[PDB]
């Protein structure tokens, strides 16, 4: 039978970021489409774009250091060292998916070290030399470091684009991957607003952003907890949405009800204008209903 | 309600102690007498113990306010949601490392919008008089310049020997003094019948390792999360366990997995056990079994 975690909200990760969920929202500016390659996971398990089972897999990359033609980058691999193949995803699994920004990362060896000296603060900037997809990305702090070392990089911080083409860190863009003619299509695919006055619900957490659009926050489609949990169970979807209830477990409320597409995104149907689930308390928990048609039709959420 | 672990392969699973990804299972011979990790500390019915959290987004992570004092400053500490830190939870805010003796060099910024990467510091977190986190307050070298009263949350990037010289490498097996200190998870101990405690292996950015960049814990991360979401009454002395194949979906091996959250095998006289199992395989939940329970040797 189908479920979701019977976890609070506030005690989960971000799907996109490894940091806590800190509100949910609606948004009216971005919500029309998103197309997010890290929290992609339909409701029977299958893993989509660069979603990792693991909140410790996201905003890591692992490569061999290369210095060609006066630029220094990683050849990448998967995590674990074993090899990317690029028929499989748009990156390596757990690639971070914010576009348009610089990425400051910690690279340390793969290998036993004795001084911080090994230890490199990189700076990532998508350029014309960012290819993940080609399995190729320059990197900036990797001068001094032997060609071939390998490395991992963990996502510390990020700030606006170098070059100078967006003035702030926008978290609802993501990366191009590659410049092919089918590139769009190697990608977990769009997410849009179904209809019925639905809106897709946002799970924001804070992460170390210079010049942020939402300042510190970064949207997600699911929390990463419940992507394991789907991969976990592997519940055959058995109807066009599975009707959720968001609980206040400590006053025993029914504070909302949210539809949960095979997609693996949330909807609910904001009140009148409004912010929705924006206002719901943090620490209330979702719990599985019954499986409905797509028009079944939502009681509004929020003021 | 039915107890389960996790059909997830273990190499795809977070280590409960540093967010790193499983590379291998083992047994010790050194360390295996007793560990007292604090986090990966949980109940087979769901209750997390020590400073434990559900999500791996929450390990080795501090949150906390900048206060100066003569010739020190640190962190008035929180727990990584902003909330305050209670002494009748948890032996230090939920998250807290449990990487004892050595230095732990973090990358702190604010947890209010900033402008520029100038607001984030390099700290550096000694575990020495100062370093009193059952009490809420630790020390750390980095923050002269960050104003008093300014919020951060720290994220530990490696750690390094002790600055005060009293250890030459970083023994992973060893835990902080938190004090003592109310809710320290209690000592784990092999159970007898040839059974030795099964460690996850992770790597972690260590500098003078006493086991290189490996790190052990008792059972990985999502097992944590597993435990607490099921709420699965404990019906039996151990849970015993198959690890299964990848392959040929074949039992490899016999574990027990007992209700203070901690997994036995009995290692092969050779004596390396689990070590020589492929990593990508799955532990499933075959039934409930007393403590005298004998297991088949596993490994070569």
């Given at each position: ?64 250091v290369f210095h060609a ?127 019925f006055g639905e809106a ?58 949210f539809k949960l597409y ?42």
């Open positions: 039978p189908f479920s979701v975690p019977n976890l609070p909200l506030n005690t989960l990760s971000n799907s996109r970021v490894p940091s806590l969920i800190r509100s949910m929202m609606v948004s009216r500016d971005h919500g029309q489409m998103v197309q997010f390659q890290n929290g992609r996971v339909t409701l029977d398990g299958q893993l989509q774009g660069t979603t990792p089972t693991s909140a410790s897999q996201l905003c890591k990359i692992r490569g061999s033609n006066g630029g220094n980058g990683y050849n990448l691999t998967e995590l674990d060292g074993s090899p990317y193949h690029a028929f499989e995803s748009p990156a390596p699994i757990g690639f971070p998916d914010l576009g348009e920004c610089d990425w400051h990362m910690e690279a340390s060896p793969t290998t036993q070290f004795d001084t911080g000296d090994v230890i490199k603060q990189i700076n990532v900037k998508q350029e014309a030399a960012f290819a993940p997809h080609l399995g190729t990305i320059q990197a900036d702090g990797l001068s001094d470091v032997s060609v071939n070392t390998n490395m991992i990089a963990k996502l510390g911080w990020v700030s606006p684009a170098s070059d100078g083409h967006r003035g702030n860190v926008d978290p609802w863009v993501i990366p191009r991957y590659g410049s092919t003619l089918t590139e769009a299509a190697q990608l977990a695919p769009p997410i849009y607003p179904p209809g897709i619900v946002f799970f924001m957490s804070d992460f170390p952003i210079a010049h942020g659009a939402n300042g510190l926050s970064v949207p997600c489609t699911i929390p990463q907890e419940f992507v394991t949990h789907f991969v976990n169970e592997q519940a055959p979807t058995r109807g066009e949405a599975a009707l959720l209830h968001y609980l206040d477990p400590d006053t025993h409320r029914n504070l909302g009800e095979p997609e693996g995104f949330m909807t609910c149907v904001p009140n009148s204008s409004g912010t929705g689930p924006q206002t719901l308390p943090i620490n209330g928990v979702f719990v599985f209903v019954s499986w409905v048609s797509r028009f079944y039709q939502l009681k509004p959420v929020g003021t």
